[PDB]
C-alpha cells in the first residue's frame, strides 16, 4: 500500500514542478539586466564593541535602531548602545550555550535560548530597575536555534526538534505548533505584517507558515544543503536563505520558486546569516571565510566585502531604518558598518 | 543639553560597572575549563557522570581537581543529528569521547569509529582535543577470553594484527585481551593520525565505568592540552 502513497506523492510533486515551470515565463536576472548596477561601496567599521568573552552566535537589532542585543556562549547577554558603544545591561544567562536572542519591538522584553531547550524571557524595564527572568519556555525537546518577537506577548521560537512553536509569554504555553520540517530548524524570519514566517530545517527547503492559521502555506526546494539563515524582503513578498552550499537563493511567496541565485566559484564555504537593507537592494550575507559579501539583489554581483572579522561570522542584521549594519563573529567583537 | 550630558555620564558609570562585572566574569571563566562528554547510547557515559557527580537539553557537571574548576557538560536529551550543535563546543578544553569497546557485534564499534572520525575531521573541531575513553574493558576481556565473538569476523585486519612493542599489558591480563584492546586502540589511532594532527591530539585511555581514576586522567589530559596550547605562544 505504501507504493500507492509513494506514486501519489511523486505525481503531486511532478504536477507542482510543471506548474512552477509554466509560471516561469521569464527570469529576474534577464529583466534586471537593464537595472543600473550598484558598483562598489567601501563600508568601514564605524564602531567597535568589546566585552564579550566567548564566541558570539546570535544578534538582533532593535526597532528603535539604538539598542542592540547580542548573545555569547559564555553565559552572558549584553545589550550595547549603537551610538555610544556603552553596555546598557549585562544579563547573565543560566544556560552558558545560548544560541539565539530576540529584542522585542517595544524593548520591554528580551528572549534567548540554546542547548538548554529553554527560551528564557527577560524584562529590561522592571519597576526595580534590574533584569530578571520573566518566563521560561521549556516545552521544546531540542536546542533553541532562533527566536523572534511578534509582540510583547507573542514570540516565535525555533528548536532542534524540527518543529516551530508559537508561545504566549503571559501563560507560557505553546499557542500553536508548526510541524512538517524534516530536519532541525536553524533561523526564523518574521514578515513586516507579523502574519507569516519562514525558516529552513537543514533539509535544503524553506516552508511558509501562518501565525494565525498554523499551517505550511508554501514550500520551496531551491537549496541543495542545510539552510542556516533566512530573512524576509522589506516588502514581505520574498525572502533569501543562506545554506552550507555557499549559495544564496531568493524565493518569492507568489512565484513559489527560486528567482535567482547569488554565489561565486571562489566562495565554497557555508553561509551563516543573511539580511536585507531597508530597500532590499543589498543582500548582506555572512560567510564562514571570516568576511561578509554584499550581493546585489538584482544584479547578482558582489557589491562589497566586509573582511573586518578574524573568526567565523555567526549573525548579521540590518537596522529597520537601514542606517548601519552590524556583523557578528566568533571573535567576540561586534563591528558596526556604514 | 545638560540633561543629555547627565544621561551620558550615567550611562558611562553603568558601562564602567558592567565592565568591572565582565572583568570578574572573565577572571572566573578563563580559570574554568569546560569539557564536552559524548558517546554512543549504549556507552557507560552515564555511569561516569554519576561517579563524577558523587528534561533540559544539556546537563552541567561541576567537579574540582587540585583546586581547578572543571565544568563537564552532558548533551543528553538531544537528537542524534550532531553536525550542527557540536560546533558550539569548538572552544572547549577537551571532548571526552566515551566508546564501548565491548559493543562490537549491529556493530556499534563501527558507528563509534565513524563518529570519532567525523569529530576529528570537523573543520570547527580541528583545534579541539578529544579524550578517548575506551570504556567497558572488563566486558571486552570477558568476551574475548571465553567467547566465540571472533573479532576477525567483524575486523579482518585483526587476523594479521599483533601486540606492539610499546604495549604495557596489565599484570595478569591474558595476552589475547591486551591484543584486542590495543587493536581497538590502533583503530582510532589510525583515524586520528592519518586524517591530520598538530592542531589537536587524542588521548586514548583504557578505563572502566567504575574507575575513579577517570577524573585524574581528565586532569592530566587538560594539563597536556593547556601546555601544548601555551607552547604556541612562542611562535612569532
Amino acid at each position, epitope marked *: 500500500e505504501l507504493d500507492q502513497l509513494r506514486q501519489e506523492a511523486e505525481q503531486l510533486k511532478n504536477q507542482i514542478r510543471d506548474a512552477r515551470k509554466a509560471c516561469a515565463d521569464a527570469t529576474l536576472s534577464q529583466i534586471t539586466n537593464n537595472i543600473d548596477p550598484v558598483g562598489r561601496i567601501q563600508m568601514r567599521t564605524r564602531r567597535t564593541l568589546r566585552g564579550h568573552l566567548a564566541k558570539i552566535y546570535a544578534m538582533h537589532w532593535g526597532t528603535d535602531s539604538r539598542l542592540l542585543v547580542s548573545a555569547s556562549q559564555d553565559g552572558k547577554l549584553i545589550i550595547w548602545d549603537s551610538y555610544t558603544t556603552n553596555k546598557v545591561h549585562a544579563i547573565p544567562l543560566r544556560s552558558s550555550w545560548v544560541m539565539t536572542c530576540a529584542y522585542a519591538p517595544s524593548g520591554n522584553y528580551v528572549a534567548c535560548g540554546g542547548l538548554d531547550n529553554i527560551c528564557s524571557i527577560y524584562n529590561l524595564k522592571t519597576r526595580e530597575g534590574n533584569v530578571r527572568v520573566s518566563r521560561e519556555l521549556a516545552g521544546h525537546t531540542g536546542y533553541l536555534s532562533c527566536c523572534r518577537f511578534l509582540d510583547d506577548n507573542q514570540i516565535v521560537t525555533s528548536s532542534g526538534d524540527t518543529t516551530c512553536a508559537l508561545w504566549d509569554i503571559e501563560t507560557g504555553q505553546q499557542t500553536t505548533t508548526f510541524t512538517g520540517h524534516t530536519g532541525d530548524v536553524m533561523s526564523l524570519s518574521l514578515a513586516p505584517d507579523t502574519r507569516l514566517f519562514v525558516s529552513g530545517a537543514c533539509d535544503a527547503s524553506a516552508k511558509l507558515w501562518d501565525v494565525r492559521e498554523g499551517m505550511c502555506r508554501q514550500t520551496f526546494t531551491g537549496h541543495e544543503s542545510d539552510i542556516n539563515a533566512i530573512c524576509f524582503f522589506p516588502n514581505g513578498n520574498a525572502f533569501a536563505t543562506g545554506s552550507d552550499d555557499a549559495t544564496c537563493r531568493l524565493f518569492d511567496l507568489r512565484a513559489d520558486q527560486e528567482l535567482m541565485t547569488y554565489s561565486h566559484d571562489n566562495i565554497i564555504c557555508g553561509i551563516t546569516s543573511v539580511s536585507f537593507s531597508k530597500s532590499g537592494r543589498l543582500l548582506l550575507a555572512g560567510y564562514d571565510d571570516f568576511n561578509c559579501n554584499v550581493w546585489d539583489a538584482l544584479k547578482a554581483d558582489r557589491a562589497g566585502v566586509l573582511a573586518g572579522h578574524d573568526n567565523r561570522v555567526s549573525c548579521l542584521g540590518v537596522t529597520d531604518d537601514g542606517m548601519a549594519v552590524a556583523t557578528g563573529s566568533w571573535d567576540s567583537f561586534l563591528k558596526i558598518w556604514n | 543639553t545638560e540633561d543629555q550630558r547627565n544621561e551620558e555620564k550615567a550611562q558611562r558609570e553603568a558601562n564602567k560597572k558592567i565592565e568591572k562585572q565582565l572583568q570578574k566574569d572573565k577572571q572566573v571563566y578563563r580559570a574554568t575549563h569546560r569539557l564536552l562528554l559524548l558517546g554512543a547510547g549504549e556507552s557507560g557515559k552515564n555511569t561516569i557522570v554519576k561517579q563524577m557527580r558523587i528534561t533540559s537539553g544539556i546537563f552541567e557537571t561541576k567537579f574540582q581537581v587540585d583546586k581547578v574548576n572543571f565544568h563537564m557538560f552532558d548533551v543528553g536529551a538531544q537528537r542524534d543529528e550532531r553536525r550542527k550543535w557540536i560546533q558550539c563546543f569548538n572552544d572547549v578544553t577537551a571532548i571526552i569521547f566515551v566508546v564501548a569497546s565491548s559493543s562490537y557485534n549491529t556493530n556499534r564499534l563501527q558507528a563509534a569509529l565513524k563518529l570519532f*572520525d567525523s569529530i576529528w575531521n570537523n573543520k570547527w573541531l580541528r583545534d579541539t582535543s578529544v579524550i578517548l575513553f575506551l570504556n567497558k574493558q572488563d566486558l571486552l576481556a570477558e568476551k574475548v577470553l571465553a567467547g566465540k565473538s571472533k573479532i576477525e569476523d567483524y575486523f579482518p585486519e585483526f587476523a594479521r594484527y599483533t601486540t606492539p612493542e610499546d604495549a604495557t599489558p596489565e599484570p595478569g591480563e591474558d595476552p589475547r585481551v591486551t591484543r584486542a584492546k590495543y587493536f581497538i586502540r590502533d583503530e582510532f589511532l589510525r583515524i586520528s593520525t592519518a586524517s591530520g594532527d598538530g592542531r589537536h591530539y587524542c588521548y586514548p585511555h583504557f578505563t572502566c565505568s567504575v574507575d575513579t581514576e577517570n577524573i585524574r586522567r581528565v586532569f592530566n589530559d587538560c594539563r597536556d592540552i593547556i601546555q601544548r596550547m601555551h607552547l604556541r605562544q612562542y611562535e612569532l
Partner: nanobody
Amino acid sequence: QVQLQESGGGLVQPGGSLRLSCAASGFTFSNYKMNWVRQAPGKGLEWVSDISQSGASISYTGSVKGRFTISRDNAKNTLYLQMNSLKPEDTAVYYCARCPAPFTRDCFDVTSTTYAYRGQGTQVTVSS
C-alpha cells in the same frame, strides 16, 4: 530538491551477486561524499561503505571488506555498489546516504531519525 533513487536490489541465493545503482539528482554529485547504509529486518541503520569525492579513498566495514566493491561516476551522477558474494545475513534495505555539506569529510548520516538527504532504499533479500 535532493532526490535519490536506489535500484538493482532483489532476491538472490547464497553466493550470488548484485549491482545496486542510485540515481542522484538535485545537487553536484562530485562535491559530496557518498555513503552506503543498510537497515536489517528488526535492526538499526548500519554503515556499509563510503567513497570520497574523487573516488580515491574507499573503505568498507569489516563484515564487507573484500566482499563488496563501491564505485562512482560523476559524469552521470550515479552511484554503484558491486556485491560479489552475498550471505543470508546481508538481507537489508540498502539506503544511499550523502554527505551533509560539500567539501567536507565529516558525515553524520547514520542518524536514526529521518535523514533529509537519503533515498527510499532498495529491498535486498538472500535466502537458500
